Enzyme design. Structure first.
Site, short mmCIF file in Angstrom:
data_model
loop_
_atom_site.label_atom_id
_atom_site.label_comp_id
_atom_site.label_asym_id
_atom_site.label_seq_id
_atom_site.Cartn_x
_atom_site.Cartn_y
_atom_site.Cartn_z
N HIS A 354 39.80 52.21 71.37
CA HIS A 354 39.32 51.19 72.06
C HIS A 354 39.53 49.90 71.53
O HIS A 354 39.63 48.69 71.99
CB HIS A 354 38.10 51.24 72.61
CG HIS A 354 37.84 52.51 73.31
ND1 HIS A 354 37.60 52.23 74.66
CD2 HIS A 354 37.18 53.74 72.92
CE1 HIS A 354 37.53 53.76 75.12
NE2 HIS A 354 37.25 54.45 74.16
N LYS A 545 30.28 38.57 79.65
CA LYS A 545 30.78 39.46 78.49
C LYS A 545 29.73 39.56 77.48
O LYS A 545 28.53 38.84 77.52
CB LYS A 545 32.12 39.13 77.68
CG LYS A 545 32.77 38.02 78.74
CD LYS A 545 33.62 38.76 79.67
CE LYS A 545 35.24 39.11 79.69
NZ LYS A 545 34.89 40.72 78.79
#
Ligand SMILES: Nc1ncnc2c1ncn2[C@@H]1O[C@H](COP(=O)(O)O)[C@@H](O)[C@H]1O
Ligand SMILES: Nc1ncnc2c1ncn2[C@@H]1O[C@H](COP(=O)(O)O)[C@@H](O)[C@H]1O
Lengths: 814, 815
Positions: A354, A545
């Protein structure tokens, strides 16, 4: 006695109607919860409804698991340290098709179902994207009929709830379990030992791992439903428990248990990682062996079929210890020889990457492993010698790459590189978007790619259209279903049929009407929480975020302050009203991130209370951003902010969520934004700023923020305001740290994208003026979001890595 | 939304028939347990059945609890540190008349209900007769329709499971909760704080307890059903939970938490336990008092003038004595009443039950301990003592010695607070536990207090539930009784009097004798399939099941067994009446003598059971791990009941009533509850041997010398030789020197004194056993005369004479 074929689920389901559901709801309030209407609180009514829905969930679960034991498919084991589940009730009802029946039932009983929904705690099981990808995947795997499992740790306090006090983040415990979790089932019967410390004793027989300390792992099952296909898979979470000179066994008891207490690092993080791997694997091997339907005995003991029957997905390097652990069990316990056991391991395991840059890659010092997992060290050294010989023969006389690819990394204290452990131990390695999977073969892992090119794949991330459209946005799900039906819910690509409606007048205003409707709902909530006042006709400009310099909520702030200064210089000029919302959690100990939060709220205090601004600009910091808040705010958003420095994001997943619900995007050519822009067309996006190659070019000649300060007067003004204490009148020097970072050492180039960001936001304001044109661009975004379904992702993981066929056909029924 | 009248228990129970029960057994296995037939174990099917039965139990619970809320009765709180409940499955099925239907239901699904019943753990929440008494008390309180609650601590570690290896007791951990407990319900909602340590701050306002360390108490409710009267009461047990820089507050986690873990084989922890149970319970009582109104949880009542009319606290022994100071604390410190009203409320609210016999066993705590842990309570205790000593000083002007005799404060090595004195000062009634016991209370240990307030002092003779200890455990006996007199006797044990009519009835005599032999045959089988054994099932069943203490005198028994043995080896061909003598009971860790006694009993067995000449004429069995469930098996099987404690050392006894109810004849002393039993049964129909209380006093008066007996009883000397020279431990000759030296030089309990009268009394037993007709006629006379010893009779008296409520034997509506 064959009299017990009458011990069966057969007709326990009942008719799933209003009549039977309310009789059931009454059973649970009184017999399960041991309450009546005199005493029952709303929470009790929630628990009674949860149990009523759960009966129907587990009926199908029993059926699914039975089906697996008689079909014997390849079982896929998803390993993660984060499952970001959110709430369960509405989801279970939509997926089982019970929402209509339950709503009516609760209604006839004097209850309001939306109230009861709002009482359920968010599962304290995940943190960010890593963890929600896991949850979306669970939902998709069940919808695509895969015999899949989620295995992780049951955290007793998740990651803290975030509260804002005086504009500062404070962390508070998240005890989401204090009243209990009705969706889970404790399994005291399946408690397993997990070993620590000890020493390796070399018998010329095998190698024994002796003198260890023991920690008990107890499993909790939660069922996960597919979308209306009657398959219901398992999420299985481990909880740590202790067994029962001096009574410093107290310390040992406490230290054993905080493996389950919290997320995030010393020994503890590594302890947590082995714990999840060791318990899961015992469970894995067990099912493999005891495979005959109706038969509890361990009938299958030939491990040549192991990779055909078991697949283990390693979500990031966290579960990496699975590799040497599998090796330990097969060589040490099962007594298979090395090469045979390795071949099995590699064919079973697969690794997803990731992260974007070599430094976030997980590493553990040897002395630590040596102390705590002494046998696993040996196995890692052994994997390493044979992998380096394989490299030697494939690239003769190359000493440099030899030590570049080694699992053992040198320096001040030797560390073991767990990403190298993952690549060597798995038949597939994937990145998480197309550009990210490319840099993995170009830069981070090129030496491995040159050794085994076949190993490396892409699997672009995605999002379940269940939770992220049908659940959180019934209005939009509805108007779409009227034109094209509801096949799209489990086949998102059908959203393209909506391209036929870009010029239909009725559809354009139905899309506009649904957005406005969600804005009104959210606005109302935003008043009875933040007690301000939101203009429901303003442009809802959202960025959610996690707080971090590279995510650049500081760049957003500059834009907000630019907007504020313009309004104040010419208070008579027409302006497109905006509500800017920033939400997200800051890591404890990350000081700059705590500053960025305080700055956002500081600006809020000024702009939200300037009589001159009125209701033309509102700045709100969204408190305790989490899955359930994301369900409320994403539907109500007009503008989605994806403004990370190009080159820093692998995927992104919340952007996909915005695209689905009819927000336009302002973002950099980075991560998932690239493929999104591709799907929709560049002209239907708002891309600005440096590309990755622009970043490098600026790095190569050296970044000086002072150059931008000198040529942009509007930027100079803001800095002088932050400097002089404009936004913190009591403490003038409060934002000194932020300013000096922006001016002298900004790794993420905020000033460099400033200019193009604000011109872009202007182009965004101009479109907003023309609601017809605005909506038509939205339709083009929505019609083109099909690719980012996680149904598409899991179908790819299934066919290209796992070797199982996706299937949308229904499992029979109870 | 007045639509919620449909949120009701109305018809959720369903018809109590085979078809619904099996359906609901299926619901519970699959939906509650999340299992199926492929994966289920006998344990799972047990849980499934339990959950099926509990459904009916809570149906009646909701109704009962509703009913109390609308009648607003005086509510009675039985506070105890022990609840010795045992199993619940069978007890609930008999008390709800569901046993037959469940049995049928399980049969049809291919399960054995007796197999299932054996899976469930004995409730590990108690220890001995104290806890078993409370369990009988709860059963009785509910059958008699009293708004009664049972409050205590939820213990996790339970007690210990006795294992016998090489004749030695070993204690194993009894974690009876590792798999959960389907009978309880957790109440996270009602988590209350308990405070510890801190300091007191005197303000011109009131006094303030501050800087405290906090432990949270979480309740768990368990329903207790009356006998077929549809009332279900609540047992409410507390569990300790820790709240959520230095982690060394890890102790806080540990030091709390294990308040729940363990009973006590006393320190700071013991006292924390006592305050814990008390502070939580009192908060809950007041809470329930304030919420007087039906349909609403508002503090509608704040007038504490009616508190003693609506609340009765029963202090079982000194363990919850802190209830008194705590009740003064809440009323004075928190509800800002003045001291006088609060005290008047306190005394009218609490009453005290003493269970023990000796001035030594009773509970004291060092002041320095109270000063640190419960600093506010010490001040309150001192104030109580000041005012109580004022009443005394007024009552007996100038009697200085009695001022210090009666004080709650005891001067000595250290200053201690005397809890017995606290309980007598803060209660309106004080009761003994049998007639002889209650009499010694006013004559000896509390004589000074009795002279102050004679009316305060009552007797409430103990009793036993005829549900668990007749109907449940001896179904064969309850059935042949029902044939003659009906089944009204089950909740009115006196009706067993009508059995006296049938003493000369030949059909009843052969039925009583047949039921006995059946149980003997049935218990012998359990002995075979659960242990290596033998057991002649025709032999006299000689049974002693107490706990192992010097005062209980299982050594007096041993001496008798060895006496018989020698005789059988002296004259092998002379007919002896065959006996199986069985001795059970737990030693108590640390007690060095008790472990030796167990070793002695087993070491005797090894010799006797494997002697060829003895054959099957004499068998000796130590009964491993005695507990409620085993009691239920052995008691119905017993012919003879050993109640042989040194006179005046047992306060009541309770097992003795069990054996009497179950067709055993008694061999015992004129002690505890025996006195009253023989009074009912008739001296004639009881084997009463040995010194009376006044003969013990008179032996202490002239001084007890065991050497006298040794020298004039040749049969006794031989036994001492055998233990000394190692006839019973040939591998370790001197193994029993500790015992010999105790018997011979310093026997606090006079084993040699009663030895000769004991053995003769046993011979009259053996003689009568030789005539089965006459033996049974005597048995009948015991059973038929057992009525007094029902706990129903007991609770009635507590209710009418202490709590001021009227018992009600009437059936509450129905599901
Ligand atoms: N051998 C088997 N035959 C049929 N069904 C099974 C078997 N083992 C497990 N199941 C089912 O699968 C579920 C999960 O069990 P497990 O996979 O053993 O954790 C159980 O609840 C059963 O319903
Ligand atoms: N005010 C009330 N009115 C009617 N029933 C009640 C009331 N309070 C409690 N109950 C019932 O009594 C049970 C015990 O409650 P509590 O006395 O609060 O422990 C509850 O489960 C209810 O069924």
């Amino acid at each position: 006695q064959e009299k017990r074929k009458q011990i069966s689920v057969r007709g326990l389901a009942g008719v799933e109607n209003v009549t039977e559901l309310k009789k059931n709801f009454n059973r649970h309030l009184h017999f399960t919860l041991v309450k009546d209407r005199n005493v029952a609180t709303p929470r009790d009514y929630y628990f009674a409804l949860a149990h009523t829905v759960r009966d129907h969930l587990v009926g199908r679960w029993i059926r699914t698991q039975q089906h697996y034991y008689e079909k014997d498919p390849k079982r896929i084991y998803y390993l993660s340290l984060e499952f970001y589940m959110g709430r369960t009730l509405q989801n279970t009802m939509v997926n089982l098709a019970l929402e209509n029946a339950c709503d009516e039932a609760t209604y006839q009983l004097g209850l309001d179902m939306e109230e009861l929904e709002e009482i359920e705690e968010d599962a304290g099981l995940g943190n960010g994207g890593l963890g929600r990808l896991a949850a979306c995947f669970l939902d998709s795997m069940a919808t695509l009929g895969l015999a899949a499992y989620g295995y992780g740790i049951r955290y007793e306090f998740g990651i803290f709830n975030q509260k804002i006090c005086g504009g500062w983040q404070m962390e508070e415990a998240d005890d989401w379990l204090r009243y209990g979790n009705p969706w889970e089932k404790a399994r005291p019967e399946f408690t397993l030992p997990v070993h620590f410390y000890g020493r390796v004793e070399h018998t010329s027989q095998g190698a024994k791992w002796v003198d260890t300390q023991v920690v008990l792992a107890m499993p909790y099952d939660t069922p996960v439903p597919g979308y209306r296909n009657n398959v219901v898979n398992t999420m299985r979470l481990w909880s740590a428990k202790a067994p029962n000179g001096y009574i410093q066994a107290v310390l040992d008891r406490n230290l054993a248990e905080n493996i389950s207490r919290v997320l995030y690092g010393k020994e503890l993080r590594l302890k947590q990682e082995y714990f999840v791997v060791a318990a899961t694997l015992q469970d894995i091997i067990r099912r493999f062996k005891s495979s005959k339907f109706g038969c509890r005995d361990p009938v299958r003991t030939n491990f040549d079929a192991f990779p055909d029957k078991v697949a283990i997905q390693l979500n990031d390097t966290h579960p990496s210890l699975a590799i040497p652990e599998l090796m330990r069990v097969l060589v040490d316990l099962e007594r298979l020889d090395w090469d045979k056991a390795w071949e099995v391991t590699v064919k079973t395991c697969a690794y997803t990457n990731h992260t974007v840059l070599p430094e976030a890659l997980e590493r553990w010092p040897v002395h630590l492993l040596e102390t705590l997992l002494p046998r696993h060290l040996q196995i890692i050294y052994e994997i390493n010698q044979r992998f380096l010989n394989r490299v030697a023969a494939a690239f003769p006389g190359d000493v440099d790459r030899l030590r570049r690819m080694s699992l053992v990394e040198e320096g001040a204290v030797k560390r073991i590189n767990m990403a190298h452990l993952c690549i060597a131990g798995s038949h597939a390695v994937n990145g998480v978007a197309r550009i990210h999977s490319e840099i993995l073969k170009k830069t981070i892992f090129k030496d491995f790619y040159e050794l085994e090119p076949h190993k490396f794949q892409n699997k672009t991330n995605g999002i379940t259209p269940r939770r992220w459209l049908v659940l959180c946005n019934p209005g939009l799900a509805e108007i779409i279903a009227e034109r094209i039906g509801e096949e799209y819910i489990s086949d998102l690509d059908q959203l393209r049929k909506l391209l036929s409606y870009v010029d239909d007048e009725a559809f354009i205003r139905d899309v506009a009407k649904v957005k406005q409707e969600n804005k009104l709902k959210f606005a109302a909530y935003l008043e009875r929480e933040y007690k301000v006042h939101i203009n429901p006709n303003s442009l809802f400009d959202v960025q959610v975020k996690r707080i971090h310099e590279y995510k650049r909520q500081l760049l957003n702030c500059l834009h907000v302050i630019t907007l504020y200064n313009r309004i104040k210089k010419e208070p008579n000029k027409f302006v497109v009203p905006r509500t800017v919302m920033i939400g997200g959690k800051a890591a404890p100990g990350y000081h700059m991130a705590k500053m960025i939060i305080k700055l956002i709220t500081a600006i809020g205090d000024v702009v939200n209370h300037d009589p001159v601004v009125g209701d033309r600009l509102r700045v709100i910091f969204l408190e305790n951003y989490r899955v359930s808040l994301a369900e409320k705010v994403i539907p109500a958003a007009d503008l989605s902010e994806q403004i990370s420095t190009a080159g820093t994001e692998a995927s992104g997943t919340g952007n996909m969520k915005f695209m689905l619900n009819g927000a336009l995007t302002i973002g950099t050519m980075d991560g998932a934004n690239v493929e999104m822009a591709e799907e929709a067309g560049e002209e239907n996006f708002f891309i600005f700023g440096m590309r990755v190659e622009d970043v490098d070019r600026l790095d190569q000649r050296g970044y000086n923020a002072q150059e931008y300060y000198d040529r942009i007067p509007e930027l100079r003004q803001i800095i002088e305001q932050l400097s002089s204490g404009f936004f913190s009148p009591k403490q003038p020097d409060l934002f000194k740290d932020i300013v000096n970072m922006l001016m002298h050492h900004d790794r993420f180039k905020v000033f460099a994208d400033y200019e193009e960001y604000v011109k872009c936001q202007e182009r965004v304001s101009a479109l907003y003026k023309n609601p017809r044109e605005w909506t038509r661009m939205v339709i083009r975004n929505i019609a083109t979001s099909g690719k980012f379904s996680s149904d598409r992702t899991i179908a790819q993981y299934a066919r290209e890595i796992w070797g199982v066929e996706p299937s949308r056909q229904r499992l029979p029924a109870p």
